C-alpha cells in the first residue's frame, strides 16, 4: 500500500508546515497593534444609490479611474455606472443571464462577466460602433465562473466552480495557464497590486497563492471553517483578507505564511459575501448575509462601522482605487456608494 | 450639468427605459428550474418541451416558459442554487427505471437530491413539478425485477400501479413544509406528448395558489 506511505508523508509535511508557522507565530497581530490609536466609529453615508438593476446584483467592479463601476445582475444586464453622477454609461445585455462575476479592465477598455454558462465573456467597451460587443468568449471551464480579474487588456485570470482557476490569453482565447490544486469550488480571486501573483479562495476552506507567470501555487492558507466566498489583498500585496460562510474574515500574510487576525463577532452568524480593503488598508469592509456591510479595523479586529441600508444580502462590494468611496451591491438590486 | 452632461443624463434615461422594457418582458417569463440526474430522462423531457447550463424556452397556451437545465453543473449546488430562488417551479426529472441501478442506488441518489432541493431554504414556496420518466421501461423491469431492491420496506405487489404509487409516495414524503409548497407528480416514458400540458397545468396551479395566498384565501 504505497498510498499509506504517501498519505503518511503528506501528513508529515503538513505537520512540518504547521510547526514552521507556529515557530514564526511569536506574537499575534492583536498583541502588536494594541498601542495603536483605534479608529472609533466611522460614519459612512450612502452618497449615491445606483438603481436600474431588476434582479439580484451578484458582482460589481470599480474602474481604475475610481468613477466608473460595472455591475452584474441576474436580469442579464451588465451595467456601467458613472458613480459621480449615477448615470448609466452602458447597459450590456448578456447571452447568459446567470452572471455571478464581473471585472472591469484596468485600462477600462473591457469588461468581463461569467457565471453558470461556464464562459467568461469579454466585452469591448470602446468600439468604433457605439455598442458594447462581446469581444471574446473564454470557454474551457467546466464549472461556473465564480470570479474573473483582468491582468491587462489581454491577460485575464478566472476562477471557476470546477475547482481550477485559469489564466487566459484573450486574443487567442486559450487558457495560457491552468491553476489546479483546489479541491473545492473556487469562489473568489484577488490579483496582487503588482499582478505577478494572485490568491484564490475555494469551497474547501483554503486560500491558495498562485504565481501567474509560472502557474503554480506558492502557499495554501487554511484557517476557515466554511466555504470562502470572498478574498482581497492588503494594498501592499503582502497580505490578504478572506470572507467565508462561517461569519469570519481572516487576514493571512503572504510572507509569514499564516493567519494574522480574525474579524469575527458573536453577533454575526451569517457568512461573508464580499471583502475589500480601504486604500491605506486600515479598514476591512466585509459584506454579509445579514443585509449590511460591516467595516472592521484591519489591525484591531474592531468593527469600526456598519454600512446598513441594503434590504437583502450584500453580495458584492469594492473600494475605489483612490479610496474615496465604497460601493456595495446587494441582492435587493441596488448599488450604494458610501463615503 | 454641462451640455454633454445633459446628453449623458439623456443616455442614462434611455438606458433606464430599455432596462424597463427588458425587465417587463422578463416578468412575463415563467422561469422553471429543471433538475434530475442526467440519465433520469430530463433530456427527453426537454425534447418533449421543444456546456454550462442549458436554457430551454417554449410557449404553451400563451405562457412563455424558460426552463433552466442545470444538471451539467457538476459543481456545488449550494453556491449557485440561490440564483434560482425566484423560480416559478422546479421540474424534477426522475427515471423510474433506476430503482435497481447503481451510480449508491440511482433512485436513492435521486431521492436525496430531491429531498435537498425540496427542503432547500431557497425553495420554501417553490412548488416542484415532479416527473417520473421511463415508465414503460419501469413496466418491463418491475415485471421481472422487484422494487424491494431499492426499497427494502416496500412490502407490496410488484405491479406497475403499486410500485409507481409507492415510488411517488416515497418522493412526496421527502417534501417537508407541505403547507408552503405542493408536488405535481407525473408519469411519462418517452412519448407522453402531454408533459408540456402537465407542466402548464402545474404552473397555472402554482400561479393561482400564490394569488390566493396573496388575498388570504390559501
Amino acid at each position, epitope marked *: 500500500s504505497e498510498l499509506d506511505q504517501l498519505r503518511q508523508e503528506a501528513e508529515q509535511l503538513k505537520n512540518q508546515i504547521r510547526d514552521a508557522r507556529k515557530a514564526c507565530a511569536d506574537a499575534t497581530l492583536s498583541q502588536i497593534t494594541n498601542n495603536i490609536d483605534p479608529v472609533g466609529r466611522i460614519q459612512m453615508r450612502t452618497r449615491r444609490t445606483l438603481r436600474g438593476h431588476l434582479a439580484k446584483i451578484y458582482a460589481m467592479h470599480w474602474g481604475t479611474d475610481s468613477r*466608473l463601476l460595472v455591475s452584474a445582475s441576474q436580469d442579464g444586464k451588465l451595467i456601467i455606472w458613472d458613480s459621480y453622477t449615477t448615470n448609466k454609461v452602458h447597459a450590456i445585455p448578456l447571452r447568459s443571464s446567470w452572471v455571478m462575476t464581473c471585472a472591469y479592465a484596468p485600462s477600462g477598455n473591457y469588461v468581463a462577466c461569467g457565471g453558470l454558462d461556464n464562459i467568461c465573456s469579454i466585452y469591448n467597451l470602446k468600439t468604433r460602433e457605439g*455598442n458594447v460587443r462581446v469581444s471574446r468568449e473564454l470557454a474551457g471551464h467546466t464549472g461556473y465562473l465564480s470570479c474573473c480579474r483582468f491582468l491587462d487588456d489581454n491577460q485575464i485570470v478566472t476562477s471557476s466552480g470546477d475547482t481550477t482557476c485559469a489564466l487566459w490569453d484573450i486574443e487567442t482565447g486559450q487558457q495560457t495557464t491552468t491553476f489546479t490544486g483546489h479541491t473545492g469550488d473556487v469562489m473568489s480571486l484577488s490579483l496582487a497590486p503588482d499582478t505577478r501573483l494572485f490568491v484564490s479562495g475555494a469551497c474547501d476552506a483554503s486560500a491558495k497563492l498562485w504565481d501567474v507567470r509560472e502557474g503554480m501555487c506558492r502557499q495554501t492558507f487554511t484557517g476557515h471553517e466554511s466555504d470562502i466566498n470572498a478574498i482581497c489583498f492588503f494594498p501592499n500585496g503582502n497580505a490578504f483578507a478572506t470572507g467565508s460562510d462561517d461569519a469570519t474574515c481572516r487576514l493571512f500574510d503572504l510572507r509569514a505564511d499564516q493567519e494574522l487576525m480574525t474579524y469575527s463577532h458573536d453577533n454575526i452568524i451569517c457568512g461573508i459575501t464580499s471583502v475589500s480593503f480601504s486604500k491605506s488598508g486600515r479598514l476591512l469592509l466585509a459584506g454579509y448575509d445579514d443585509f449590511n456591510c460591516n467595516v472592521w479595523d484591519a489591525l484591531k479586529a474592531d468593527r469600526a462601522g456598519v454600512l446598513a441600508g441594503h434590504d437583502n444580502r450584500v453580495s458584492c462590494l469594492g473600494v475605489t482605487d483612490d479610496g474615496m468611496a465604497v460601493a456595495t451591491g446587494s441582492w435587493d438590486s441596488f448599488l450604494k456608494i458610501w463615503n | 450639468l454641462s*451640455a454633454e*452632461d445633459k446628453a*449623458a443624463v*439623456e*443616455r442614462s434615461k434611455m438606458i433606464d427605459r430599455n432596462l424597463r422594457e427588458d425587465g417587463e418582458k422578463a416578468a412575463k417569463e415563467v422561469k422553471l428550474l429543471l433538475l434530475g440526474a442526467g440519465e433520469s430522462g430530463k433530456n427527453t423531457i426537454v425534447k418533449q418541451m421543444k456546456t454550462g447550463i442549458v436554457e430551454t424556452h417554449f410557449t404553451f397556451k400563451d405562457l412563455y416558459f424558460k426552463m433552466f437545465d442545470v444538471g451539467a453543473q457538476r459543481s456545488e449546488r449550494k453556491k449557485w442554487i440561490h440564483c434560482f430562488e425566484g423560480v416559478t417551479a422546479i421540474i424534477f426529472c426522475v427515471a423510474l427505471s433506476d430503482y435497481d441501478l447503481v451510480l449508491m442506488n440511482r433512485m436513492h441518489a435521486s431521492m436525496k437530491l430531491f429531498d435537498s432541493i425540496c427542503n432547500n431554504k431557497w425553495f420554501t414556496e417553490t412548488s416542484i413539478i415532479l416527473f417520473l420518466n421511463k415508465k414503460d421501461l419501469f413496466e418491463e423491469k418491475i415485471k421481472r425485477s422487484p422494487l424491494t431492491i431499492c426499497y427494502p420496506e416496500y412490502t407490496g405487489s410488484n405491479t406497475y400501479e403499486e410500485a409507481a404509487a409507492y415510488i411517488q409516495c416515497q418522493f412526496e414524503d421527502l417534501n417537508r413544509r407541505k403547507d408552503t409548497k405542493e408536488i405535481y407528480t407525473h408519469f411519462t416514458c418517452s412519448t407522453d406528448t402531454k408533459n408540456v400540458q402537465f407542466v402548464f397545468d402545474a404552473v397555472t396551479d402554482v400561479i393561482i395558489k400564490n394569488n390566493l395566498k396573496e388575498c388570504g384565501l390559501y
Partner: single-chain antibody, 232 residues
C-alpha cells in the same frame, strides 16, 4: 463605420430640401447626430443636433424654426428638413455622429457631406492666427481663444479640435481639451485653461496639412473657431 449624406445641389432661394444621412456600420440609434455646415470657403458652423432617441433637439439660432432635423432609427438614416433656403444656407452639410457618456468621444466620425448651392450670448471661438506656414517635421502650436471659460465645474473643458484635410471631411483630434481621439497619432496634444487653448503638434508630417478648427461644447450653440489653416 461610415456616414453617407444624400440630397444637396442647386436649389432656388426660398425652396425646401431634405438631406438624408444613410448611416451604416455603427449603432446609429445610440448616437446623438449633428448637422455641421461649412460655407464653400468659410469655417464650420453647427446646424442642428438630434439626440439619441430623438428626445432632445437643438438648432442653430440662424436656422431655428427654419430647419427641421429628424432621424429614422430603424433605417439608420438622419434627415434635415430645410425650408425657405436663404442664400446663406449655401454650404457643405456634414452629418456628424456624437455619443455622450462618461469618457465618450463626441464628433468622432463625420460624413462626407453634400454640396448645397442656393441660387442668388453664444460662446465665441476665436482663432486669431490663421494660415500658419510650417515645415514638415517641425512642431507647431495653434492657439484657440474662448469668449467664455470652457472649463465646467465638473472638471471637463469642452474644447474640440478637428482637422479639415483638403478634400476631406473634418476629423476629431482632441475631443475634450487634452484628449487624443481614436486613430489620431500621439503627436497632437491639446493644452489650455479657461478661455485660451493650444493644440501642439510634436513632429508633423505631410498628413497634418489642413485646416484646424476649434469647437466649444459647453452649451448648444456649437460655435467653431475660424479655421487655422496649415500649409507647407
Amino acid at each position: 463605420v461610415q456616414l453617407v449624406e444624400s440630397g444637396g445641389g442647386l436649389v432656388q432661394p426660398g425652396g425646401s430640401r431634405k438631406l438624408s444621412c444613410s448611416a451604416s456600420g455603427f449603432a446609429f440609434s445610440s448616437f446623438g447626430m449633428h448637422w455641421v455646415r461649412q460655407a464653400p470657403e468659410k469655417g464650420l458652423e453647427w446646424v442642428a443636433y438630434i439626440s439619441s432617441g430623438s428626445g432632445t433637439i437643438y438648432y442653430a439660432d440662424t436656422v431655428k424654426g427654419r430647419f427641421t432635423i429628424s432621424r429614422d432609427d430603424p433605417k439608420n438614416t438622419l434627415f434635415l428638413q430645410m425650408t425657405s433656403l436663404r442664400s446663406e444656407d449655401t454650404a457643405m452639410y456634414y452629418c456628424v455622429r456624437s455619443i455622450y457618456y462618461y469618457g465618450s468621444s463626441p464628433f468622432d466620425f463625420w460624413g462626407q457631406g453634400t454640396t448645397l448651392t442656393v441660387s442668388s450670448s453664444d460662446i465665441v471661438m476665436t482663432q486669431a492666427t490663421s494660415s500658419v506656414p510650417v515645415t514638415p517635421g517641425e512642431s507647431v502650436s495653434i492657439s484657440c481663444r474662448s469668449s467664455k471659460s470652457l472649463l465646467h465645474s465638473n472638471g471637463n473643458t469642452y474644447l474640440y479640435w478637428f482637422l479639415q484635410r483638403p478634400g476631406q471631411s473634418p476629423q476629431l483630434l482632441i475631443y475634450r481639451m487634452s484628449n487624443l481621439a481614436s486613430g489620431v497619432p500621439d503627436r497632437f496634444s491639446g493644452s489650455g485653461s479657461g478661455t485660451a487653448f493650444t493644440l501642439t503638434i510634436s513632429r508633423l508630417e505631410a498628413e497634418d496639412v489642413g485646416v484646424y478648427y476649434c469647437m466649444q461644447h459647453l452649451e448648444y450653440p456649437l460655435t467653431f473657431g475660424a479655421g487655422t489653416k496649415l500649409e507647407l
